[PDB]
Amino acid sequence: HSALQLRSRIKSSGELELSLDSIDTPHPGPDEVLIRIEASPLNPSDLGLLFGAADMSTAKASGTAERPIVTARVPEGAMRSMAGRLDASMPVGNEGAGVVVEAGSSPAAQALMGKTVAAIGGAMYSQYRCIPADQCLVLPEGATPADGASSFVNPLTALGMVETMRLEGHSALVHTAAASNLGQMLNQICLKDGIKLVNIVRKQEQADLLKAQGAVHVCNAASPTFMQDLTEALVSTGATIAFDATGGGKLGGQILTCMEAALNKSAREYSRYGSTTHKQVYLYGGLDTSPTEFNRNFGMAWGMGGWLLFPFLQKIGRERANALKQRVVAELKTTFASHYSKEISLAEVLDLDMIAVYNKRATGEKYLINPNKGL
Amino acid sequence: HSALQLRSRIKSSGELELSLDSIDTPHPGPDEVLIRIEASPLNPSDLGLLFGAADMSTAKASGTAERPIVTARVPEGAMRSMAGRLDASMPVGNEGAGVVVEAGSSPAAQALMGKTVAAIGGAMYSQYRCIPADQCLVLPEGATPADGASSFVNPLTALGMVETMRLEGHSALVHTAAASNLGQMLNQICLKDGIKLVNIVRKQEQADLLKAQGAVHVCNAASPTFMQDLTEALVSTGATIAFDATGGGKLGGQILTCMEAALNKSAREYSRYGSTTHKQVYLYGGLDTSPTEFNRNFGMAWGMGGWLLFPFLQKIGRERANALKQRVVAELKTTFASHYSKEISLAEVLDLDMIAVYNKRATGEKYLINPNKGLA
Ligand SMILES: NC(=O)C1=CN([C@@H]2O[C@H](COP(=O)(O)OP(=O)(O)OC[C@H]3O[C@@H](n4cnc5c(N)ncnc54)[C@H](OP(=O)(O)O)[C@@H]3O)[C@@H](O)[C@H]2O)C=CC1
Numbered sequence: 087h088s089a090l091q092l093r094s095r096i097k098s099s100g101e102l103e104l105s106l107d108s109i110d111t112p113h114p115g116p117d118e119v120l121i122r123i124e125a126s127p128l129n130p131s132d133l134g135l136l137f138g139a140a141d142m143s144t145a146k147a148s149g150t151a152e153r154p155i156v157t158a159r160v161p162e163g164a165m166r167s168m169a170g171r172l173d174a175s176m177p178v179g180n181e182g183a184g185v186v187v188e189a190g191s192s193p194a195a196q197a198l199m200g201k202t203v204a205a206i207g208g209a210m211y212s213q214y215r216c217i218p219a220d221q222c223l224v225l226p227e228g229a230t231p232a233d234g235a236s237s238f239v240n241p242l243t244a245l246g247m248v249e250t251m252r253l254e255g256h257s258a259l260v261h262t263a264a265a266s267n268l269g270q271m272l273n274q275i276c277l278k279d280g281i282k283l284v285n286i287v288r289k290q291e292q293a294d295l296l297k298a299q300g301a302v303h304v305c306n307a308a309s310p311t312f313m314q315d316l317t318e319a320l321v322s323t324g325a326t327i328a329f330d331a332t333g334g335g336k337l338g339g340q341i342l343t344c345m346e347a348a349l350n351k352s353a354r355e356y357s358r359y360g361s362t363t364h365k366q367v368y369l370y371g372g373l374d375t376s377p378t379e380f381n382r383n384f385g386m387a388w389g390m391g392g393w394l395l396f397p398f399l400q401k402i403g404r405e406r407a408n409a410l411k412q413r414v415v416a417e418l419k420t421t422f423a424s425h426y427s428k429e430i431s432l433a434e435v436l437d438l439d440m441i442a443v444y445n446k447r448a449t450g451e452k453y454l455i456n457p458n459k460g461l
Numbered sequence: 462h463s464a465l466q467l468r469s470r471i472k473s474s475g476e477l478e479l480s481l482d483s484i485d486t487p488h489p490g491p492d493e494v495l496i497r498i499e500a501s502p503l504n505p506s507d508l509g510l511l512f513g514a515a516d517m518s519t520a521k522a523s524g525t526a527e528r529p530i531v532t533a534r535v536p537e538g539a540m541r542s543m544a545g546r547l548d549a550s551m552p553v554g555n556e557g558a559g560v561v562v563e564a565g566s567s568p569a570a571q572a573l574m575g576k577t578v579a580a581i582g583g584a585m586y587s588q589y590r591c592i593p594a595d596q597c598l599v600l601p602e603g604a605t606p607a608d609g610a611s612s613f614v615n616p617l618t619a620l621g622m623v624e625t626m627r628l629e630g631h632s633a634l635v636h637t638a639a640a641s642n643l644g645q646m647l648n649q650i651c652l653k654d655g656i657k658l659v660n661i662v663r664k665q666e667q668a669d670l671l672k673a674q675g676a677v678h679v680c681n682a683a684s685p686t687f688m689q690d691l692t693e694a695l696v697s698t699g700a701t702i703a704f705d706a707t708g709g710g711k712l713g714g715q716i717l718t719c720m721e722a723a724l725n726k727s728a729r730e731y732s733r734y735g736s737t738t739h740k741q742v743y744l745y746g747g748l749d750t751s752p753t754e755f756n757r758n759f760g761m762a763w764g765m766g767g768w769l770l771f772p773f774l775q776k777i778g779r780e781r782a783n784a785l786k787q788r789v790v791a792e793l794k795t796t797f798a799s800h801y802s803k804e805i806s807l808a809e810v811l812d813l814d815m816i817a818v819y820n821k822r823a824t825g826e827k828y829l830i831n832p833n834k835g836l837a
């Protein structure tokens with residue numbers, strides 16, 4: 087049999103073509119299972135791969151309603167960033183969940199037969215995926231695929247922020263774009279675990295959503311007293327590590343500047359180079375594509391850098407990663423609940439009206455894909 | 462007796478006052494020595510303390526020729542940054558060298574009597590300093606105080622860059638403002654030790670200088686092909702750690718961008734997030750006072766942060782710190798040689814004409830103070 091899977095092709099011509107390809111469905115080998123995928127989130131990392139650097143204002147629809155095609159043009163300036171995927175037909179979708187419908191002969195694979203599972207196997211925007219049994223997370227009794235669709239990326243990143251805070255000797259943390267699904271989870275984790283947290287948003291609606299969910303400190307970057315508000319929240323929390331999803335713009339430096347201000351309130355001597363307390367900002371997303379810019383008014387005890395989930399998980403090791411996953415399974419519908427504004431079919435992923443919404447990365451407007459919808 | 466020491470005072474009034482204070486000279490306790498300081502450099506770290514956030518374009522001279530005063534205004538916007546030192550009379554000068562003229566009773570202190578020593582004691586812009594025996598570095602035979610005046614800050618930082626490179630798992634390095642005194646030392650270390658090094662300068666004449674000193678790789682930020690030149694140098698050297706003296710501006714991000722370009726020439730697969738090889742830029746100076754700005758076109762495996770000598774020495778421990786200091790002594794006049802364009806008295810530090818030159822932190826224009834020059 088064959089079935090459909092989304093593909094994203096950036097051509098050397100400068101064209102993006104998004105399509106639903108007909109792909110033969112493998113039978114699983116001894117150590118594999120075949121999963122009928124029923125739920126897979128559209129996260130920012132997936133959008134990055136889906137559209138690459140295409141200018142989506144140039145998008146045009148062709149194909150048929152059942153087999154849509156979207157083409158768009160990548161600007162000349164962006165082509166070098168695409169070099170490594172030129173002329174490659176890329177499957178899309180980091181993670182998802184569904185039902186195991188075939189299992190290879192091994193006892194590991196056989197033990198998953200008929201179970202509802204989640205996996206971060208890539209190519210999850212697909213009707214069927216043949217995956218190793220050891221890459222599957224069995225979901226709790228009563229969890230639907232939609233309940234388990236987002237078990238890996240956001241939950242483990244949220245837990246990994248706290249883990250990183252501890253490992254690197256900090257006691258409280260700051261998180262930006264905090265009304266994201268990930269931010270909502272982090273807030274739940276911090277409230278439950280007694281970890282002081284500064285949430286940073288950019289609209290009062292976002293601040294209300296978090297306050298409604300019990301957030302103690304919410305600072306609005308849009309506010310004319312933001313720096314005052316943030317400094318006061320940092321005095322309160324003692325946070326010296328930050329996770330910034332924006333990446334570009336000024337927020338990273340603003341946070342460093344406010345941390346140093348907060349630290350200096352308790353400074354006992356004059357320090358030539360500021361506080362000796364290390365302040366860290368991790369840029370773990372790139373929602374703001376403008377240049378990163380900051381003044382260095384925070385002394386010498388600071389760092390900023392990238393953060394990625396998979397290298398993190400490799401660092402803490404598989405046992406500790408498992409302890410984190412166990413928590414996610416146990417709290418799947420509470421601490422690690424995700425909200426989606428819409429559930430759509432594979433064909434609907436390539437509807438220009440759908441793209442127009444979900445490609446905003448707007449608060450409360452995450453879409454869930456059901457590759458098999460209505461069938 | 463008493464003798465002179467420079468003082469820098471930023472007052473709550475918004476005024477910087479620079480002066481020579483008359484300070485009673487201590488007699489050393491058992492574990493101390495008294496040094497007559499004959500050589501102390503004006504390094505950028507010192508100038509930071511000396512002038513603070515004062516706008517020196519507003520500086521004014523008063524006092525007398527032998528006892529000069531300089532006053533200047535700190536702008537209101539900088540006063541928060543000065544908060545920790547308001548109304549404090551600050552001694553200045555991290556490091557220097559001189560002769561031990563009195564020693565406390567302990568054998569450790571007695572062993573230094575009459576020796577030429579260097580110390581990083583602070584308050585070195587002073588005719589005499591009473592400091593612990595255990596903070597003195599005994600200089601080698603035939604070294605004048607001038608020869609040892611700069612034994613700590615630049616030599617140990619240069620060695621510390623190489624140490625940090627190794628500690629953090631890198632095999633080669635990049636260094637900016639490379640025609641600095643420190644840069645010239647770093648290039649000699651790397652030549653002698655066989656470390657691949659990319660030197661970045663801002664003027665072609667600085668590239669000429671380093672090439673004349675044997676530098677293998679020198680890139681000029683003013684070059685119209687800078688990014689290509691830097692990327693090629695990074696392919697050649699495999700460097701994945703940089704020390705940036707500029708801090709502000711674009712150079713840090715440029716380096717990261719070129720490092721990722723160089724790494725991706727060996728890319729086996731397509732990484733959604735670029736190379737997995739960690740690239741690190743330490744901003745160890747702030748010569749460029751503008752905002753730091755960069756595009757993040759270098760993947761996720763990167764870091765940028767501050768770097769300071771004293772936290773570093775504390776991290777490596779006293780034994781390893783002592784081994785670095787021993788190498789500095791051994792190569793004091795070769796690898797770790799420092800050039801000064803002028804030697805000035807204590808009173809001349811406060812001459813606005815002298816300030817106008819030394820405060821540029823211009824290549825080959827480092828000034829050496831002899832606190833006892835012209836004095837009894
Ligand atoms: N490094 C890593 O391994 C990983 C990173 N991530 C990152 O975490 C972040 C959250 O993911 P997720 O919970 O799925 O996101 P959501 O789609 O659920 O929420 C996104 C949030 O970002 C805000 N936002 C969008 N654009 C900007 C902007 N330019 N500046 C400031 N805020 C903005 C939105 O607010 P508004 O309504 O105002 O648009 C919204 O609240 C993303 O950057 C994602 O890439 C997630 C997992 C791992």
Ligand SMILES: NC(=O)C1=CN([C@@H]2O[C@H](COP(=O)(O)OP(=O)(O)OC[C@H]3O[C@@H](n4cnc5c(N)ncnc54)[C@H](OP(=O)(O)O)[C@@H]3O)[C@@H](O)[C@H]2O)C=CC1
Pocket residue numbers: 504505506614615618638639640641642643644663664706707745746747748749750768769770771821822823824825826827
């Ligand atoms: N973090 C730490 O613990 C320490 C840091 N340092 C730092 O090392 C650096 C070198 O010190 P040192 O060798 O004594 O300095 P020098 O005075 O010998 O040389 C300074 C160099 O900086 C260049 N420069 C000056 N201003 C700028 C600018 N705006 N942008 C780019 N380049 C500039 C000069 O070139 P030009 O002629 O073009 O002006 C010159 O080549 C300094 O930043 C110093 O603070 C040193 C020791 C320890």
